[PDB]
Amino acid sequence: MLDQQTINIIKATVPVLKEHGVTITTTFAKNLFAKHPEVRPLFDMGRQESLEQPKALAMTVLAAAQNIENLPAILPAVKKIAVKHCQAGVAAAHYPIVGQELLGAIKEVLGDAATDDILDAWGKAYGVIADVFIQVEADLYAQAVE
Amino acid sequence: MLDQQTINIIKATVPVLKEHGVTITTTFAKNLFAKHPEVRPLFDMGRQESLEQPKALAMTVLAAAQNIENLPAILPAVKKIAVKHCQAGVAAAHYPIVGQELLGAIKEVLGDAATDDILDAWGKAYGVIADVFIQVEADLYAQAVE
Ligand code: HEM
Ligand code: HEM
């Protein structure tokens, strides 16, 4: 769970990230497929627009973060994505890889505007968001096997 | 995390529980020490007022639940309690025992006013609250050993 100070940092910086949003998500997607090529097969690798799915991944993290004090209002969105995640075989162990690369992309694009304090706050926000997905997906996986 | 429907149930029933608050917490305390006598030594078993600590335990759960959509505002209270929990040697495995007995006490006192749907919602709220304590305490324990 986030403390108020961390929430305030997210609130203050979400608009900076969104101003650079296409560049962050595009950098994330490129870095993810270049540094972790093992995740490529899980996505649709159509020749031209092969970055659109991982760009939307990163963009949705940013959108969930801007909504971090009302995650219950977006739980129905989280559940729809979870079904797709479970059908693609996304595992809890994938989530730290994605978080690492997203934080890396934010620093790569924002430069000195992404301080250690700001990156730490985004890291904590990502963890809270990921934990919701992991739990929903764990339950869905358990329903399908029992 | 709670969904909105569950949050609404907690919001609607917290005042019913508080109207019976002394009776719920007293019943919880008696049942806890009678059905799980192994937890007795962790508390202060002074002759007369030996129920005041576990009554305050239950009352604070109810207070956290009424604040379940702003847990960040009570995190400083959670941290102070966590230090006491860690000094008493409270373990993650204690939390389902306490939740079981608190839900049992709520049903015992409220009777037919505590429906299955209401009890299920209080069970989910307890889990979210306990998870915050467990995480804070896990970190504190790790600081003291490393
Ligand atoms: C951390 C929070 C995450 C969020 C908010 C999120 C969000 C999304 C969204 C919105 C989509 C739909 C994309 C679209 O159809 O346009 C998606 C799809 C997908 N994501 Fe996630 N994701 C997260 C984590 C992950 C992780 C850790 C992986 C692991 C590789 C992952 C892999 C996938 C895959 C394989 C798809 C399938 C594409 C599709 O069917 O649309 N996602 N994710
Ligand atoms: C589930 C959420 C819980 C909450 C909100 C909570 C709350 C509290 C509070 C407010 C106190 C201080 C009591 C006072 O001094 O008046 C306390 C103390 C204590 N609680 Fe917890 N508690 C929880 C879980 C537990 C659990 C699972 C145990 C396991 C047995 C536990 C055992 C203790 C003990 C041994 C004390 C020491 C009494 C003291 O130093 O005051 N608590 N708890």
Alpha-carbon gap, residue B130 to B124, rounded angstroms: 10
**A47 CB-contact burial (10 Å; exposed 0-12 / middle 13-18 / buried 19+):** exposed
Q: Which of B64, B67, B39 is nearest to B53 (CA)?
A: B39
How far apart are the C-alpha atoms of A89 and A67, rounded to whole Å?
A: 26
Q: How was this structure determined?
A: X-ray
Is B3 within 8 Å of B121 (Cβ atoms)? no
Q: State both tokens at B11.
A: 């919001």
**Cβ count within 10 A of residue B16:** 14
| Token digits of residue B53 | 């600590």
Handedness of CA A48, A54, A57, A61 (dihedral sign): negative
Resolution in angstroms, to 1 decimal, for this deposition?
1.7
Strands (E), chain A: none
Euclidean distance between CA atoms B72 and A35, whole angstroms: 36
CATH 2.30.42.10 for domain B1-146, yes or no, is: no
Q: Is the CB of A26 under 6 A from ligand 1?
A: no
Question: CB under 8 Å to B56, separation ≥6 — which residues?
Answer: B25
Q: Answer yes or no: are the C-beta atoms of B115 and B106 closer than 8 Å.
A: no
Q: Annotated binding residue at A53?
A: yes
- Return the best residue to mutate from A55, A57, A128 for the ligand 1 pocket (most ligand atoms within 8 A of CB): A57
**Cβ contact (<8 Å) for A71 and B7?**
no
Which residues, in sequence order, are CB contacts of B39 under 8 Å at separation 6+? B32, B33, B94, B97
Work out the widest C-alpha separation in chain B, in whole angstroms.
50
If 0-12 CB within 10 Å is exposed, 13-18 middle and 19+ buried, where does residue A93 land? exposed
Which is the catalytic residue, given A19, A49, A69, A95?
A95
Nearest CA in chain A to B8: A72
Within 10 Å of residue B118's Cβ, how many Cβ atoms? 19
Distance from CA of A40 to the nearest CA of B (A): 31
Q: Which of A49, A52, A101, A137 is an active site residue? A: A137
Taking alpha carbons only, the member of B54, B27, B28 closest to residue B40 is B54
B68 Cβ contact list (under 8 Å, min separation 6): B2, B7, B10, B125, B128, B129
